[PDB]
């Protein structure tokens, strides 16, 4: 899962959480990206089993929701680590965005346990299990 | 901003320089098993970055180049320590560290070093720079 | 204009795929140029830093600036060739000599030299000179 | 001859002109280069036979003064071409330094003839025969 794919899935999820499949043209508008690039990327996400197309548009799958939650956990876990070692809370977020999605899963899991199985990031936002 | 492929170049160049010899494009290409044209091209990017100087006698590593080698080694070894401390086998820790160590900012690596108690050696018993 | 001859080859190889409607994959570029994938990956990231390519999921795509710098080197090579033939150098030797420095000449010089030579359309080998 | 080598020779000649061999340490000072790079480079200036090292210091040879005057000629012949095509002469001087040293000899000669065998660059500096 790339950070860009992360943006798509969060966007798609906002619509699904509102009762609607995500339309290509709206993802396009909301993200500021060509409709054809959005179409191409949606097919890619469908091939990975993270979304599924229905009559009213794109819907995130259970595996899609898992990938979202996993990347949220990676972002916020690193953040806690960076804040512990003495980086300011906002700079921690920006740094974490640069490589959180690249860190092997084992490391995120062991960091989570190592940090106390922390329920929240330094910005008060929840950390999935 | 130093890739692991750049690291390999720098270490190869440094081997030749440490014996009093410019690193020849052709020998670099043979040591890394890559094409002389690719070496010539990458070397000019390493020059733009202030890490080497290309001269008549071949390529020489600069002070910033040497520093950059040392920074990556520290990053690699400091991360290994954190990984072992969170319960990862040291061989797996080494392999994992190589996948992202060169991407971590200088700020994170220095602060993490201090956070771990200024370790002097990585779990393989190899020295961590200051 | 800060674009090497080797970079030029990369960009012409990337453009061939892109002209055809697909992204240039790291390993296709590598095989076409007869070099190592790791070298192509490394060089591609430098070309992305210069804003001449964009690496996407599909592969590598040339940016507008990339296309622009391909044309600018072609213009530089061929405008210089014309100067060299007009001052008495044989065209094959002109081609070879031009390659030794064409890529180092700043934009201003090539555009002014183009005007000075009367805005020529084709080099002495009969190939087109971009504007 | 490279332009970096050319700096070395212009610095070394200045000391030789006042009547002394240039010291490795003074060369470094003047050029803002580390002494161990200057030592290494002078010894290759010696292997190319453009300088000769002695107890009082490095001295530029007939060959060394020759290579200076050649690069000078190239620089100034190129400047005239550039001013002829409409480039400001201050811009022409700086632009010329980016490639004057890399231009094959035969082009400089054909350009010199083509330009009328000029005796001055656009700034009035004389052009070596
Ligand atoms: Zn994708
Ligand atoms: Zn955050
Ligand atoms: Zn897990
Ligand atoms: Zn947060
Ligand atoms: Zn590089
Ligand atoms: Zn030299
Ligand atoms: Zn040497
Ligand atoms: Zn290791
Ligand atoms: Zn180790
Ligand atoms: Zn390049
Ligand atoms: Zn040609
Ligand atoms: Zn031609
Ligand atoms: Zn000048
Ligand atoms: Zn002048």
Closest approach of D32 to chain B, Cα-based (Å): 14
* In chain B, residues 97-126 whose CB comes closer than 8 Å to chain A: 99-100, 103-105, 107-108, 111-112, 114-115
Range B115-125 burial, b when 16+ CB lie within 10 A, else e:
eeeeeeebbee
Burial of D18 (0-12, 13-18, 19+ CB in 10 A): exposed
The helix (run of H) or strand (run of E) holding residue B27 is helix B25-32
> What is the distance between the alpha carbons of residues D28 and B111, in angstroms, rounded to a whole number?
37
Kindly write down the DSSP assignment for every residue of A71-103, as one continuous string.
HHHHHHHHHHHHHHHT--HHHHHHHHHHHGGGS
Residues in C closer than 8 angstroms to B38, CB to CB, are 35-36, 39, 43
Q: Are D49 and D61 in contact (CB under 8 A)?
A: yes
> What is the distance between the alpha carbons of residues A57 and A51, in angstroms, rounded to a whole number?
10
> What is the distance between the alpha carbons of residues A96 and A115, in angstroms, rounded to a whole number?
16
User: Most B CBs within 10 Å: which of D33, D43, D44, D46, as the mutation test of the B interface?
Assistant: D44
DSSP for residue B103: G
Q: Quick one: tokens of B70? A: 């040392």
Locate tokens 């820790």: which residue?
B93
> What is the distance between the alpha carbons of residues B61 and B22, in angstroms, rounded to a whole number?
9
- φ/ψ (deg, to 5) at B58: 115, -165
Q: Quick one: tokens of C37? A: 């994938």
The residue range of the domain holding D68 is 1-129
> What is the distance between the alpha carbons of residues D20 and C130, in angstroms, rounded to a whole number?
54
Residues in D closer than 8 angstroms to B53, CB to CB, are 37
> What is the distance between the alpha carbons of residues A75 and A68, in angstroms, rounded to a whole number?
11
> What is the distance between the alpha carbons of residues D53 and D45, in angstroms, rounded to a whole number?
10
Q: Does C5 touch chain D (CB under 8 A)?
A: no
Q: Are B29 and B84 in contact (CB under 8 A)?
A: no
Kindly write down the DSSP assignment for every residue of D10-31, as one continuous string.
HHHHHHHHHTSPBPHHHHHHHH
> What is the distance between the alpha carbons of residues C92 and C53, in angstroms, rounded to a whole number?
32
- φ/ψ (deg, to 5) at D22: -75, 130
Cite the DSSP H helix spans in chain C. Answer: 5-19, 26-33, 37-49, 64-86, 91-99, 107-116
How many degrees, rounded to 5, is the angle at CA C91 between CA C86 and CA C95?
Answer: 110
CATH, residue B37: 1.10.10.10
CA of B89 to the centre of ligand 8 (A): 12
Residues in D closer than 8 angstroms to B60, CB to CB, are 37, 40
> What is the distance between the alpha carbons of residues C51 and C73, in angstroms, rounded to a whole number?
16
Dihedral of alpha carbons C106, C107, C108, C114, sign = positive
Closest approach of D122 to chain C, Cα-based (Å): 16
Q: Are D78 and D100 in contact (CB under 8 A)?
A: yes
Closest approach of C36 to chain B, Cα-based (Å): 6
Resolution (A): 2.3
Ligand nearest to C-alpha B47: 5
> What is the distance between the alpha carbons of residues B34 and B57, in angstroms, rounded to a whole number?
21
Q: Are B58 and B72 in contact (CB under 8 A)?
A: no
Q: Are C66 and B65 in contact (CB under 8 A)?
A: no
Contacts by D112-116, CB closer than 8 A, 24 or more apart: D112/D73, D112/D77, D113/C87, D114/C87, D114/C88, D115/D77, D115/D80, D115/D81, D115/D84
> What is the distance between the alpha carbons of residues B91 and C123, in angstroms, rounded to a whole number?
60
In 3D, which of C120, C124, C80, C128 has the Cα closest to residue C102? C80
The helix (run of H) or strand (run of E) holding residue D84 is helix D62-84
In 3D, which of D8, D87, D85, D100 has the Cα closest to residue D45? D8
> What is the distance between the alpha carbons of residues A89 and A79, in angstroms, rounded to a whole number?
8
In this structure, chain C runs to a length of: 131
Residues in D closer than 8 angstroms to B57, CB to CB, are 40, 44
- φ/ψ (deg, to 5) at D11: -70, -50
Q: Are A50 and A13 in contact (CB under 8 A)?
A: no
> What is the distance between the alpha carbons of residues A124 and A81, in angstroms, rounded to a whole number?
15
Per DSSP, the three-state class of C47 is helix
Give me the total of CB pairs closer than 8 Å, taking one residue from chain B and one from chain D. 13
Q: How many CB atoms lie within 10 A of CB B114?
A: 11
Cα separation values, D13 from B28, D3, D46, D54, D57, Å: 36, 15, 14, 15, 12
Q: Are strands D58-60 and A57-60 parallel, antiparallel or unpaired?
A: unpaired
Burial of A93 (0-12, 13-18, 19+ CB in 10 A): buried
Total of domains in chain B: 1
Give strand pairing partners of D52.
D59
- φ/ψ (deg, to 5) at D47: -65, -35
Q: Which residues of B are annotated as a binding site for Zn(2+)?
A: 6, 41-42, 45, 56-57, 76, 80, 94, 106, 110, 122, 124
User: Most D CBs within 10 Å: which of B20, B22, B56, B62, as the mutation test of the D interface?
Assistant: B56
């Amino acid at each position: 899962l790339s950070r860009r794919e992360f943006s798509y899935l969060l966007t798609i999820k906002r619509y699904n959480d509102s009762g609607e499949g995500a339309k290509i043209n709206r993802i396009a508008k909301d993200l500021k990206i060509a409709p054809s690039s959005v179409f191409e990327e949606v097919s890619h996400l469908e091939e990975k089993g993270l979304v599924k197309k229905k009559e009213d548009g794109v819907w995130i799958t259970n595996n899609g929701t898992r990938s979202i939650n996993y990347l949220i956990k990676a972002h916020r876990v690193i953040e806690i680590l960076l804040v512990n070692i003495g980086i300011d809370k906002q700079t921690a977020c920006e740094y974490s965005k640069q490589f959180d999605y690249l860190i092997p899963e084992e490391i995120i899991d062991k960091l989570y346990n190592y940090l106390g199985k922390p329920s929240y990031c330094p910005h008060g936002l929840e950390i999935p299990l």
